Design a protein around this ligand. Structure first.
Ligand SMILES: CCCCCCCCCCCCCCCCCC(=O)OC[C@H](COP(=O)([O-])OCC(O)COP(=O)([O-])OC[C@@H](COC(=O)CCCCCCCCCCCCCCCCC)OC(=O)CCCCCCCCCCCCCCCCC)OC(=O)CCCCCCCCCCCCCCCCC
Ligand SMILES: CCCCCCCCCCCCCCCCCC(=O)OC[C@H](COP(=O)([O-])OCC[N+](C)(C)C)OC(=O)CCCCCCCCCCCCCCCCC
Ligand SMILES: CCCCCCCCCCCCCCCCCC(=O)OC[C@H](COP(=O)([O-])OCC[N+](C)(C)C)OC(=O)CCCCCCCCCCCCCCCCC
Ligand SMILES: Nc1nc2c(ncn2[C@H]2C[C@H](O)[C@@H](COP(=O)(O)OP(=O)(O)OP(=O)(O)O)O2)c(=O)[nH]1
Lengths: 341, 368, 100, 62, 67, 165, 95
């Protein structure tokens, strides 16, 4: 996505606008930063070579400006009812604020734009979409204290995001549906902590960088395209596909750690039924992760024989192999970590 | 385009030639080093197409030495079967299974009906597509124009030529059409196309005059295959490429003269197509801004692994292009335990490489 | 006011944008709330500082004053509709034009 | 004696873990202490705006 | 040279840039002249402004003649 | 009273905005809604600066893009219906006589004008449109309008890239 | 009450413009024009809020700048499909 320096300019201004959003002490400067982030994320997610990217940017524009005007209208309504930004007893205007934030984030009652837009993108604007663009709404969700909207969103996110990814054989829509399920674990962590959410979001972001770099360097967009992917040693293809088992939450790899910290903090906060509802609905996520892992866990395949050289970037794959090592051997660093406490 | 005879000497570059085979060209290299500062009238891509017996290497060599350009030779399958260290992988044929053995154009000349031939043409496309980008990296980064004996735009003519004689199935046509529809829209069309016209009998006469030991006593070059390809050139490939590239028909049934076609090239005005913005001719090279020029240079000097990873189409419904898994395993155990390709090129200590303990230089656009 | 999650240099501009501190009928009420939110924080300030919250909201929100005005105007119209008050004594002595 | 020492260490760790769970529960019940369960609301911007509005009263003139 | 080319092709923009440079110079001159004296304490206040003698602002009033 | 007239006009133009479908006709309904919105926001305020700002920015500045795009989008003319005009006139006369039979003191807005303020208010006598616009050009809120001008330049840079020129 | 008599009408017209924004009987240009209708209603409600405070009305040209940049962004998104989807994409009833 670095074909121009103007895209680097749009990247730093969308970083600036997101930081204006998450540091605003009022409900209107947050909307100001949301509009800055929207202005800088319209030209990214748009390109001349791909036809679907322009209508996907149209879908993003209509979804975000529908969500931002409802966010502005409800914040002005809250300010008209009580003139401070906070609220003593929570009421329906906070529900409209949280629903407008859930349309921005992509919770499962309002998530239907997310994989339908994801069906026509590249793998770097998807990396910006499921990681950085989830910063601006989710950090405003932590300011509200209503429980049942978060409960409905978490439950609907972990059933709908896990079941709906089974039919999808495109890798982008499957990763969007997997990010919808990993969104629900972040909102379940938001009801109990503002630090365990940062733990889950940072390592989910880390897993998103290391897993979307596999599909961006080698240009993989399909489940059948993974079977035809040529790696010179099949042990390396087997080892590189352990990031799916890592992100699915398996104990020897990293990615078990943030889910485990969410489990540890939720049980200490006496919330057991919602945890069971999420973890019976996270096995389906590992099922469509293991359906990807059909293409590497067996050691020999009926490969197409016209391609015999593996072509790859140098700097991007050099950054990829550092993060693949810490995705599967990163549980040795739990003794050095001190940010859980 | 101006020749050496009218100019009175060699051409001068407008800027320093960028070492595109050593230094990468990212956006942080594109901030400082501009790419439209070294372009002139001799920065065109010329493809010299024709039948299989027409003299095109000699003509492209004298056109490159006359118009001050670089001659890119025709691709052959020695580029895969001989590695960077010079070892020939045709000597691994008894170790390889018979469904995964070597298949050069010599094996096509004696045995055109083999199942590997449907792979072979695709491999030829993977050497034309890999050459043209290597041509484009010479145009955008150094400013010197290139001349090509063969182009990937004209490789489908040979595909339907082996299809019409019966050497390919319908599935081989389908997978080559899928690969072409996946890949041909990512590389810029040439500026100028020269077709060295030959009749079907003179092609056979030049084939028996060349006396190459596999062209003679081969049933491939019959009166139907050559006629099919010369018909198919002039009514598919030339008609497709004339919308963008200038098309020059030259009666090459004689020995052919070089000064007359340089004269015919030099009277072509190249600036009249840039007056109309939405003109079909030279549309792919019409970049109105320097940022679009640098994006076009980045697309071929830095994003060549993307265009080489665009050949990753899965099509398992054909039985003659699917390598079986035990054969693929023993093919890996033979091919990647060779003296040439045990490691990446430049890092194999078995074939005379030293200083590997302090060497961390990978290389640019290197096949692994 | 909302507590931001991060305290970066980028909150320095957004923070002063809306505030009753610039001359206003009762920004001195809001300051008496705001320093209270420095004392107990945001969450204990919702409970331990509820008396100073309602005065600022009463002043600038103008809730009970407008509700009392609408109670005094609807009762007068109800007395008009019920026949107790009618004629030229429906409206009282008007104020002077520079009284307020 | 090694098992006795390890059991004593693990038992004392259990008591300190129970006590810090109780302390954290009483801290989150009241939002009293300034380390955890505390949302720092600052009126630095309000005092800055009030100081600026007091400074522009001197600037008012001709 | 370079200024001759700009004065040949675009003379109004050169004259406007000279005017803008002169305006920037006299803007800095006006700022330095405003802050060299007590420009923050204006002579002619708006409204009805009174200070008692115990206030610190009453000792900073200007007793200059009307200009 | 005239505030209730602007309420009635905005209601009538909004329901005909919901009814009609021709894109230049919705653009015309927006340009005639913007005038009533400007006047009605002028009724609450001390002075008419922000109504003028909304006027130049929205109507004369921005909606001309909408009028141009909707003019080149539709080849055909308006199909004027006397039924919709009669219904709009009937609901307009009904809402004006409803404002006639309603007490205007209770229906007036609580937001103070420049003359609704106290006579002893020192700040109202100084200069029209002075203290409200002051925080645009003072510390520390000048960084927002510097960021706004930078935002408009960056917006132009975005628009040139996305239209592809 | 206070909400029924004051600022009730911007809420009702905001919901009407929201329903015009999302109805399947309209087109994309109608969505953009109804979007600027709810921008106008948002300005109305924001100015009713900002005039309870005396001298904070300067924020009205900040929201104006952001929403006008949104409207120009939406128009430049919509007309960028002219060279790709043709001139008939303005009549599309579905996305
Ligand atoms: C006592 C009671 C007596 C009886 C009263 C009966 C009332 C009901 C019947 C009349 C009626 O409404 O007919 C409907 C009949 C049908 O109209 P429509 O098809 O619904 O819409 C009008 C056409 O679009 C108009 O299409 P057009 O472009 O051909 O219109 C020509 C235009 C020509 O306009 C002019 O000549 C007006 C000149 C400029 C005037 C100022 C600017 C406006 O006429 C008007 O604008 C008419 C006003 O309308 C009229 O007859 C209009 C005049 C009333
Ligand atoms: C009572 C008066 C009687 C006489 C006048 C009667 C008529 C009333 C007045 C009418 C005026 C004419 C109206 C129509 C004009 C039509 C022509 C037109 O638009 O021309 C545009 C032309 C166009 O410029 P141009 O001529 O450079 O462009 C054409 C040439 N090409 C395209 C090749 C570049 O002129 C201008 O725009 C000039 C700029 C405005 C005027 C100059 C202001 C400069 C700043 C002030 C001085 C700066 C300091 C100088 C000294 C110090 C220097 C270091
Ligand atoms: C008051 C005038 C109302 C005119 C009107 O609404 O005309 C209907 C027409 C409707 O145009 P239309 O072609 O969109 O009609 C669809 C709506 N029906 C079928 C219900 C009538 O609007 C105009 O002609 C707009 C004129 C300019 C309005 C400003
Ligand atoms: N199957 C197949 N055969 C090809 C293809 N391209 C070339 N050939 C074969 C056909 C002929 O035997 C021979 C073509 O000869 P060339 O085009 O290389 O020209 P040649 O070297 O004879 O003369 P020249 O160098 O042009 O003077 O190679 C291809 O794409 N597929």
């Amino acid at each position: 996505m670095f074909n121009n320096s103007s895209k680097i300019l749009f990247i730093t201004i969308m970083i600036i606008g997101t930081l204006i959003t998450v540091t605003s002490n009022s409900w209107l400067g947050a909307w100001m930063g949301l509009e800055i982030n929207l202005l800088s994320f319209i030209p990214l997610l748009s390109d001349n070579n791909n036809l679907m990217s322009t209508e996907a940017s149209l879908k993003y524009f209509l979804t975000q400006v529908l969500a931002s005007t409802v966010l502005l209208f409800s914040s002005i309504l809250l300010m008209l009812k009580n003139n401070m930004n906070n609220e003593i007893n929570e009421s329906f205007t906070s529900m409209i604020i949280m629903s407008a934030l859930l349309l921005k984030s992509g919770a499962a009652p309002f998530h239907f734009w997310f994989p339908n837009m994801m069906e026509g993108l590249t793998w770097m604007n998807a990396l910006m979409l499921m990681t950085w663009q989830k910063i601006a709404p989710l950090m405003l969700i932590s300011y509200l204290n209503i429980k049942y909207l978060l409960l409905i969103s978490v439950i609907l996110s972990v059933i709908i995001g896990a079941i709906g990814g089974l039919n999808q054989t495109s890798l982008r829509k499957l990763m969007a549906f997997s990010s919808i399920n990993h969104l629900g674990w972040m909102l379940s962590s938001l009801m109990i902590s503002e630090s365990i959410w940062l733990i889950y979001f940072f390592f989910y972001s880390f897993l998103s960088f290391v897993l979307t770099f596999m599909f961006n360097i080698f240009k993989l967009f399909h489940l059948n395209q993974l079977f035809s992917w040529f790696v010179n040693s099949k042990i390396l293809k087997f080892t590189l596909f352990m990031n799916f088992l890592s992100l699915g939450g398996l104990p020897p790899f990293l990615g078990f750690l943030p889910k485990w910290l969410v489990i540890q903090q939720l049980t200490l906060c006496n919330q057991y039924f919602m945890l069971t509802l999420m973890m019976m609905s996270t096995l389906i996520t590992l099922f469509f992760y293991l359906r990807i892992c059909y293409s590497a866990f067996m050691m020999n395949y009926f490969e197409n024989n016209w391609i015999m050289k593996m072509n790859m970037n140098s700097i991007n794959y050099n950054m990829y192999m550092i993060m693949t090592f810490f995705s599967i051997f990163g549980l040795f660093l739990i003794s050095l970590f001190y940010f859980m406490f | 385009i101006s020749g050496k005879t009218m100019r009175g000497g060699p051409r001068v570059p407008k800027a320093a030639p960028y070492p595109y085979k050593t230094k990468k060209y990212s956006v942080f290299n594109a901030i400082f080093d501009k790419t439209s500062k070294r372009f002139d009238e001799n920065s065109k891509v010329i493809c010299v197409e024709g039948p299989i017996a027409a003299g095109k290497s000699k003509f492209a060599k004298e056109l490159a030495e006359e118009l001050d350009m670089e001659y890119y030779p025709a691709v052959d399958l020695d580029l895969i079967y001989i590695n960077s260290y010079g070892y020939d992988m045709r000597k691994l044929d008894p170790q390889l299974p018979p469904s995964c053995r070597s298949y050069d154009v010599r094996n096509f000349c004696l045995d055109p009906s083999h199942d590997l031939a449907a792979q072979f043409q695709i491999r030829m496309y993977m050497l034309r597509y890999s050459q043209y980008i290597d041509a484009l990296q010479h145009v955008l980064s150094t400013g010197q124009g290139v001349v090509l004996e063969r182009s990937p735009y004209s490789d489908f003519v040979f595909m339907e030529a082996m299809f019409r004689q019966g050497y390919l199935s319908r599935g081989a046509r389908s997978v080559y059409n899928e690969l072409r529809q996946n890949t041909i829209g990512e590389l810029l069309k040439p500026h100028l196309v020269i077709y060295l016209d030959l009749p079907v009998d003179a092609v056979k006469k030049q084939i028996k005059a060349r006396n190459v030991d596999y062209e003679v006593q081969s049933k491939v070059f019959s009166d139907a295959y050559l006629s099919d390809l010369e018909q198919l050139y002039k009514q598919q490939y030339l008609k497709d490429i004339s919308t963008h590239a200038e098309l020059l028909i030259y009666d090459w049934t004689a020995g052919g003269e070089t000064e007359v076609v340089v004269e015919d090239i030099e009277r072509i005005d190249f600036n009249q197509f840039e007056a109309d913005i939405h003109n079909k001719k030279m549309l792919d090279w019409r970049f109105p801004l320097e940022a679009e020029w640098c994006e076009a240079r980045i697309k071929y000097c830095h994003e060549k692994p993307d265009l080489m990873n665009y050949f990753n189409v899965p099509r398992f419904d054909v039985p003659e292009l699917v390598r079986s898994a035990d054969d693929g395993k023993v093919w890996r155990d033979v091919w990647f335990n060779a003296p040439g390709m045990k490691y990446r090129p430049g890092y194999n200590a078995d074939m005379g490489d030293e200083g590997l303990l302090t060497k961390t230089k990978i290389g640019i656009n290197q096949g692994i | 006011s909302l507590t931001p999650f991060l305290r970066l240099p980028l909150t320095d501009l957004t923070g002063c944008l809306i505030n009753h501190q610039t001359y206003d009928k009762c920004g001195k009420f809001e300051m008496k709330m705001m320093e209270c939110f420095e004392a107990y924080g945001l969450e204990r300030g919702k409970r331990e500082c509820a008396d100073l919250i309602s005065d600022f909201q009463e002043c600038v929100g103008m809730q009970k004053q407008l509700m009392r005005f609408h109670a005094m105007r609807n009762e007068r119209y109800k007395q008009w509709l019920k026949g107790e008050r009618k004629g030229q004594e429906f409206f009282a002595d008007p104020p002077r034009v520079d009284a307020y | 004696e090694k098992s006795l020492h390890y059991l004593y260490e693990e038992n004392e760790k259990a008591q300190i873990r129970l006590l810090e769970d109780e302390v954290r529960r009483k801290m989150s019940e009241r939002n009293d202490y300034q380390a955890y369960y505390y949302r720092p609301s600052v009126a630095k911007y309000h005092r800055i705006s009030k100081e600026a509005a007091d400074e522009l009263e001197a600037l008012r003139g001709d | 040279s370079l200024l001759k080319r700009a004065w040949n092709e675009i003379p109004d923009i050169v004259g406007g840039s000279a005017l803008a440079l002169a305006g920037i110079v006299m803007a800095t001159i006006g700022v330095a002249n405003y802050y060299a004296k007590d420009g923050d304490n204006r002579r002619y206040k708006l409204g009805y402004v009174v200070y008692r003698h115990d206030d610190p602002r009453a000792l900073k009033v200007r007793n200059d003649e009307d200009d | 009273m005239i505030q209730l007239m602007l309420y009635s006009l905005i209601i009538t133009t909004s329901i005909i905005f919901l009814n009609m479908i021709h894109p230049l006709a919705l653009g015309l309904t927006l340009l005639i809604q913007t005038i009533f919105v400007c006047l009605l926001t002028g009724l609450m305020t001390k002075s008419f600066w922000y109504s003028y700002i909304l006027f130049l920015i929205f109507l004369g500045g921005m909606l001309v893009l909408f009028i141009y795009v909707t003019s080149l989008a539709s080849n055909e003319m308006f199909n004027l219906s006397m039924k919709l005009t009669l219904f709009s006139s009937l609901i307009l006369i009904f809402m004006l006589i409803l404002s006639f039979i309603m007490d205007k003191t209770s229906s007036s807005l609580f937001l103070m004008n420049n003359d609704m303020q106290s006579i002893i208010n020192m700040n109202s006598y100084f200069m029209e449109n002075s203290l409200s616009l002051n925080k645009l050009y003072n510390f520390p809120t000048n960084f927002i309008t510097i960021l706004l001008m930078n935002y408009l330049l960056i917006t132009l840079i975005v628009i040139v890239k996305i239209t592809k020129l | 009450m206070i909400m029924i008599l004051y600022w009730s009408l911007p809420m009702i017209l905001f919901i009407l413009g929201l329903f015009c924004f999302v109805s399947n009987r309209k087109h994309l240009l109608s969505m953009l024009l109804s979007l600027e209708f709810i921008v106008l209603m948002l300005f109305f409600m924001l100015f009713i809020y900002l005039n309870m405070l005396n001298y904070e009305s300067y924020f009205s040209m900040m929201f104006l700048t952001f929403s006008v940049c949104e409207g120009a962004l939406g128009l430049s998104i919509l007309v960028s499909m002219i060279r790709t989807h043709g001139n008939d994409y303005f009549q599309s009833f579905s996305i």
